[PDB]
Amino acid sequence: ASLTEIEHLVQSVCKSYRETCQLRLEDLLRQRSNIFSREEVTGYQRKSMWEMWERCAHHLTEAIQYVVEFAKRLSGFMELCQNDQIVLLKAGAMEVVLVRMCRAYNADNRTVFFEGKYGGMELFRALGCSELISSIFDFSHSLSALHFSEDEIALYTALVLINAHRPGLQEKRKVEQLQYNLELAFHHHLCKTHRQSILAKLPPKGKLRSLCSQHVERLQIFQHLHPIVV
Ligand SMILES: CCS(=O)(=O)c1ccc(CC(=O)Nc2ccc(C(C)(C)C(=O)Nc3ccccc3)cc2)cc1
């Protein structure tokens, strides 16, 4: 893999992320002053846990759909067998969402974009799972503070997804080769942008898995068997 191949692969992954990022970064940041009022917050707190889990699942499933599309545009991804595609997506899509969603987090007032406005962790009271939400907010606070560029998000989320250690993979060696090229690209690009300092600051990969797994443990009771097309 020449300089040209790596630098192509960078530009390419950043293309596919931009065409699938769901909400423009620009819009997210401008909407930061649009904050839920105390009345609006109380409205969400009073909702049943069934309705809140349903709404949140719906928004997560939409976010996953845009991640499927991102994966469908990674060159390498389609070359894999139907089984591994599904395996990487089942395991990975939600972890990508978690990373992506840090774009919708405002560290100044500890709020997240949700149904057209910004609100704090208190919006989600009715869900019951306060430890989890706090962990998600702490994680996002942490990721927020190192100012991931959009291309950094693209390169990083591509590696979140293209992970050769996922159990169930039938063509593991192929995923490794692809994981390896995405690593060269990420590192290459960090080098050119003088951003190599973020590497030691990234979360451990087991952290994404655990937050997303903890999530699904407290969601299992309300939602399972989600249709999600490829
Ligand atoms: C993700 C792409 S994006 O364009 O940046 C974006 C699109 C749409 C939205 C609006 C939007 O769905 N907000 C939203 C949705 C859910 C949650 C909660 C309920 C806390 C949640 O469960 N978060 C979570 C995320 C990943 C993994 C596990 C849990 C909080 C906020 C926000 C950001």
- The three state secondary structure string of 182-204 is HHHHHHHHHHHCCCHHHCCCCCC
The helix/strand count (H/E) of the chain reads as 9, 3
Q: Phi first, then psi: what are they for 146, rounded to 5°?
A: -100, 10
The b-or-e profile of 73-97 (16+ CB within 10 A means b, else e) is bbebbeebeeebbebbbebbbbbbb
Class of domain 1-230: mainly alpha
- The rounded distance, in Å, linking the Cα atoms of 142 and 69 is 27
Q: How many residues does the chain have?
A: 230
Cα dist from 208 to 99, 136, 191, 212, whole Å: 8, 10, 25, 6
Residue 183's contacts (CB-CB under 8 Å, 6 or more residues apart) are 159
Give the bridge partners for 136, in sequence order.
none
Query: 101 C-alpha to center of ligand 1: Å?
Result: 5
- The rounded distance, in Å, linking the Cα atoms of 144 and 103 is 7
Which residues have CB under 6 Å of ligand 1?
21-23, 56, 59-60, 63, 94, 97-98, 100-101, 103-104, 112-114, 124, 133, 136, 212, 215
Q: In what order do the strands lie in the sheet with 117-119?
A: 105-106, 111-114, 117-119
Where in the chain are the domains? 1-230
DSSP letters, 31-98, are GGG-B--HHHHHHHHHS-HHHHHHHHHHHHHHHHHHHHHHHHTSTTTTTS-HHHHHHHHHHHHHHHHH
- The rounded distance, in Å, linking the Cα atoms of 27 and 47 is 28
DSSP 8-state code for residue 227: -
